[PDB]
Amino acid sequence: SFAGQLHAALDRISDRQAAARVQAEKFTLGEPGIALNDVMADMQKASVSMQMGIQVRNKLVAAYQEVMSMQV
């Protein structure tokens, strides 16, 4: 179970980003009950998650290239 786990990770990241986006969209239209500090914190958490994801992607692709560029 590798591709399934990777797709689950991507699903979680995209879901968090979508939640942040919809919360910001709900706030900017004037719906009560949404806090500016709350939406800012959620957006920052989403950005941190995306940065972690891209770091993992870079590490994995670098390892793949290093391990498959060698000559047997």
Binding site: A24, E25, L29, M43, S47
Partner: protein
Amino acid sequence: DRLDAALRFQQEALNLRAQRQEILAANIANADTPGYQARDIDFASELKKVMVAVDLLYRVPDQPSLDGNTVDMDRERTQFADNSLKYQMGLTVLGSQLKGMMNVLQ
């Protein structure tokens, strides 16, 4: 075009914030013109219409004035401050989204 729409929501929000700021500045500048009617727009419905050529509404007066001037001061000043803060909030949200999109390509 997907990028176009995804940034377009916030871009249109910012544009409408700028228009409302301009109208607030206009009714601040003309605050002492007799026979003037306070003007404003409904941000939520206007944004909904634009997402799915701008109409403006007359602000409800609060106190009578003989010279025919209905633009209050305190209410519109609070509106000006709120609009400026929300414009800055939209600006920083758009900037964060753009930077997050950009740094992925690094």
